[PDB]
DNA sequence: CGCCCGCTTCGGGGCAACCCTGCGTCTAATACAAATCCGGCAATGGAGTCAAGACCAGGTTCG
């Protein structure tokens, strides 16, 4: 489970993050899972940041560094001949 | 007169090329070492700056 753990930490998303945000993430993740289980709604960032005894700005870094990319090879308009990268100046 | 045996003819199978009847959350850390950022003095040394101050040369004024 060790090295199973570690293997996805390290080559299953695109660019590449550390194992040390991987687990901050993990765990934010896990908590604003619980915390929507518990309270109904989504958390208040302040709240969260609360809960993981850390500061808000660094849950907003946290929340910005596990934006996974999106790709460039699916149908933005209707037609299926409209890629998503013809619209990008 | 009947009989084998490959040659051609069609069937069926098999396969290659395109769409949606397609389109899940997961142990949890510690311990340590190396690398790297960065913050703050601590030597500068060269490059810019102010000011004096001298250098005549030819208009300009005066004799």
Do not use: C, W
């Not at 208040?44 to 996974?68: F, H, N, S």
């Not at 990319?69 to 699916?74: T, V």
């Amino acid at each position: 489970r060790q090295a199973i753990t570690r293997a996805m930490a390290d080559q299953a998303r695109t660019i590449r993050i550390p194992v040390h945000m991987v687990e901050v993430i993990n765990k934010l993740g896990r908590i604003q899972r619980e915390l929507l289980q518990d309270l109904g709604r989504e958390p208040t960032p302040e709240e969260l940041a609360k809960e993981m005894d850390i500061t808000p700005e660094k849950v907003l870094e946290i929340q910005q560094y596990a934006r996974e990319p999106i790709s460039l090879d699916q149908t933005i308009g209707d037609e299926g001949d409209s890629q998503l990268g013809d619209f990008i100046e």
